[PDB]
Amino acid sequence: LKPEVVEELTRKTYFTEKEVQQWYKGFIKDCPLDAAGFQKIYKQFFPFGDPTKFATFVFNVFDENKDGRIEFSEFIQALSVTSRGTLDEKLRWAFKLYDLDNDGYITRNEMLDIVDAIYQMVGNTVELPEEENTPEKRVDRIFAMMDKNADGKLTLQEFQEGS
Amino acid sequence: LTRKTYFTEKEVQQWYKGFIKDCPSGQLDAAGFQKIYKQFFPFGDPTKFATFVFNVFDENKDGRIEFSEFIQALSVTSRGTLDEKLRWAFKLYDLDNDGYITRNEMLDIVDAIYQMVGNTTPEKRVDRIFAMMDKNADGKLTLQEFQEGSK
Ligand SMILES: [Ca+2]
Ligand SMILES: [Ca+2]
Ligand SMILES: [Ca+2]
Ligand SMILES: [Ca+2]
Ligand SMILES: [Ca+2]
Ligand SMILES: [Ca+2]
Numbered sequence: 001l002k003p004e005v006v007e008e009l010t011r012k013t014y015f016t017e018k019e020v021q022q023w024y025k026g027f028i029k030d031c032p033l034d035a036a037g038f039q040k041i042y043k044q045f046f047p048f049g050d051p052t053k054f055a056t057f058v059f060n061v062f063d064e065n066k067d068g069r070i071e072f073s074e075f076i077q078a079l080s081v082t083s084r085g086t087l088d089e090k091l092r093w094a095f096k097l098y099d100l101d102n103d104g105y106i107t108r109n110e111m112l113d114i115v116d117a118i119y120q121m122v123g124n125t126v127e128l129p130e131e132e133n134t135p136e137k138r139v140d141r142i143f144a145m146m147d148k149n150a151d152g153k154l155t156l157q158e159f160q161e162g163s
Numbered sequence: 164l165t166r167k168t169y170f171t172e173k174e175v176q177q178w179y180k181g182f183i184k185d186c187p188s189g190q191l192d193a194a195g196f197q198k199i200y201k202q203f204f205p206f207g208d209p210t211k212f213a214t215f216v217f218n219v220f221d222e223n224k225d226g227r228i229e230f231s232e233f234i235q236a237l238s239v240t241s242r243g244t245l246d247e248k249l250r251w252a253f254k255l256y257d258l259d260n261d262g263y264i265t266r267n268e269m270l271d272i273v274d275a276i277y278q279m280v281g282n283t284t285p286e287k288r289v290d291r292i293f294a295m296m297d298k299n300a301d302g303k304l305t306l307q308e309f310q311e312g313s314k
Contacts, residue, residue, distance in 0.1 A: 023198075030195030031186055041185065042203055045196065046216070047240030048252075051203070058205065070202075078205045082282070094206060094283045114283065122276055126245070126313050127252035129273055129292055 001025075009073065013080035020076065027072055034068050035059050049125040053117035061096050091160045098159075106154035112139045168235055169242040175234065182230050190227045193217055204279040211275035219254045249310045256309075264304035266293055 006020045015023070033041065035056070042055040062070045062078055081093045098106045098114050116135040123131045131138070146154055146162030154162075165175060186195065193214070200213035218224070222232045239251045256264040256272050266289065274285040296304055296312030304312075 026194065026198050031191055031199045038202070040181075041199065044185075044237065045199060046203060047236065055203075058203070062202070062205070075202070079201055082205050082207060090282060097206070097283060118280060118283070122280075127248060127255075128276060129269075129288060130276070132288075 005073075009076050013076055014084045015076065015080060023076055023079070024072055027075060033070055035063075038070070046121070048127050049121040049123075051121050053113075054121055057097060057100075057114060057117055088160070091163055092156065094163075095156050095159055098154075104156070106159060108139060108143055108152060111143065111154070112136070115139055165231070165234060168238040170234070170238055178234055178237070179230060182233060189230065192227050196220075196228070200279075206282045207279045209279040211271075212279050215255055215258070215272065215275060218258075219251065245314065246310055249313055250306060253306050253309055256304075262305070264309060266302060269293060269304070 002021065002024055006017050009015070009020050010017050013020070031041065031045075038059050039052065039055045042051045059070070060066075062074055064074050078093075081089045085093065095106070096102070098111050100110045100113060112135055115138060119131065119135045122128045123135075133141075142162070143154070146158045148158055164172075166172060168175075170178065183189065185191070196217045197210065197213050200209035200216075203209060217228075220228050220232055220236050222235070236251070239247050243251070253264065254260075256269055258268050258271060269292075270285055270289045273289055277285050292312070293304070296308050298308060
């Protein structure tokens with residue numbers, strides 16, 4: 001399966017032509033997916049807190065062409081940046097998660113929406129440790145630091161340098 | 164025939180329907196469990212935490228998740244009492260299954276959580292909660308110390 005797609009998903013991911021095949025072999029086999037399916041599979045296999053919120057945010061970054069499904073092209077490239085990507089690409093990858101409305105800015109409420117979604121999964125359970133502060137207070141501390149010009153919005157540059 | 168779980172036998176029918184809908188082979192192994200965690204945390208490396216969680220699901224430790232282990236795990240974690248939820252979590256921390264949670268084991272859990280999201284310290288954090296829960300200061304955590312310490 002997969003012919004000259006492998007060559008293409010090699011130049012865009014820096015995975016080898018041996019790794020792209022195994023990830024496809026594993027993609028259609030194993031466990032699996034639309035938004036509903038990914039959301040419920042996240043609830044089943046990650047039984048700590050409520051992964052409902054974060055599952056939605058993650059799915060939307062996965063589904064780049066916004067068709068309601070995660071094709072192999074989107075999955076292998078998303079996996080690429082976090083595992084093989086440069087620091088710049090990784091911070092830009094994190095930026096898309098926070099930038100909910102995709103306008104090139106991170107607002108205080110946008111960052112709060114992400115932090116709180118993560119907080120509900122591992123930060124607020126009685127089973128897993130963490131945190132020490134609150135998504136309310138953590139975002140205020142980090143926003144005050146990164147927002148150099150204090151305009152209430154975070155650019156990619158402010159986000160990158162702050163990190 | 165598992166009336167032994169907080170599910171009705173009307174709910175059990177539906178969960179098997181969903182099980183064979185997910186993994187039709189009836190056996191999701193470590194590799195399959197590992198890659199979906201890659202999906203659940205595409206901002207780091209969920210490898211460590213995926214392994215730990217998988218070991219708690221797979222109760223008989225054969226490297227596979229049968230329906231029996233899957234249906235019992237969902238029960239305790241989603242509908243179980245606080246003690247039962249804390250007891251199920253205890254197995255996660257207790258890596259070597261000796262009935263204790265040691266300092267490095269909990270550190271192994273926290274950093275595993277730290278590694279999966281670490282882009283968007285574990286040392287100072289573990290010292291804080293371990294000192295709190297370990298009442299007799301023997302360097303080990305019992306289920307009782309863990310349960311009371313969490314509440
Ligand atoms: Ca898509
Ligand atoms: Ca925005
Ligand atoms: Ca700004
Ligand atoms: Ca098993
Ligand atoms: Ca132990
Ligand atoms: Ca003790």
